[PDB]
């Protein structure tokens, strides 16, 4: 799947790669023992391979989902190619970055 950034702004794309806990979970969900995800743009390209191991549970899940992101520049195209395990983007964000700020952690009302 390709997406051409026609927003005249940066687009923030996020996605995920799912790592099952055993090979049977892999086969049931994706029907391949060996999957891979590729995300590639004009200045981004990573390949993501699922890595299956016994892990301690977190929120009662032994599996894991690794989350990733990139800022697709105006005019550039991002391409997703997957054999399995891809947590695909559905909604993304068109933004223009400001001069540069930070996070405040508080309970004071607005």
């Amino acid at each position, epitope marked *: 799947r390709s997406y051409v950034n026609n927003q005249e702004k940066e687009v923030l794309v996020l996605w995920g790669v799912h790592h*099952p*806990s055993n090979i*049977e*979970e892999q086969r049931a969900l994706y029907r391949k023992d060996n999957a891979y995800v590729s995300v590639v743009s004009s200045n981004y390209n990573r390949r993501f391979t699922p890595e299956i191991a016994k892990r301690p549970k977190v929120r009662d899940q032994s599996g894991r989902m690794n989350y990733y992101w990139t800022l697709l520049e105006p005019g550039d195209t991002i391409i997703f190619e997957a054999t399995g395990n891809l947590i695909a983007p559905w909604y993304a964000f068109a933004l223009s970055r400001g001069p540069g700020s930070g996070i405040i952690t508080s309970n004071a009302p607005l």
Partner: antibody
Amino acid sequence: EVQLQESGGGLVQPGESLRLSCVGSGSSFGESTLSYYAVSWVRQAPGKGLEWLSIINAGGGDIDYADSVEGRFTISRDNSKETLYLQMTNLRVEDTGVYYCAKHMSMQQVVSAGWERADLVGDAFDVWGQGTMVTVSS
Amino acid sequence: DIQLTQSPSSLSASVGDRVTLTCQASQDIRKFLNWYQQKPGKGPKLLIYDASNLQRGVPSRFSGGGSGTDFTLIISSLQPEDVGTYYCQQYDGLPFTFGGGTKVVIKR
């Protein structure tokens, strides 16, 4: 693959009860046993066609019934035992027939992966039992 | 409810003949339609799932076509092991309903 074996049927008086059991065994893709799938009961009266009765999803939710058996029949499943049930009540003569246990094609949950399907598909019956016969006659 | 009408009620054919079984639906059920063979005394075995997909291990001669309200199962080279009753069944909505069946009869 997954095999299915109905049991617990036979001859019962009118207005009585009877509990059919459907036992699963074996596994499909990804070591998926019967608790990964949604199952339905389907009956066949002697010499006639197939009538769907009730459906239950993998986790035991989204029960539904055919109007003809609503209130009398109750579906359920002990996934620990990989077994389905059909609790028939107030049995009428026309309830006589061969009661089948039929698995739906699509995978509905993979519990160890923490994956569920948001909907209940209820698509093709790719595995049936040999059937158990229920004869309602005084 | 939803009514499935199957034509004909039975067809007599010879080995090697190509036969077309009809299953028309009382409303647009997209491609949520499947076909089962049922030899007598035995349970139904699935042939075609979702209008046009051949189920694993079913002979390649079985084909299925259709969408909307007009569906057909096509047995390409009819074999004596095909004798039996063929039911179409839908799941576009509850209650799940079957056609009346079409009995295949062999001429020899």
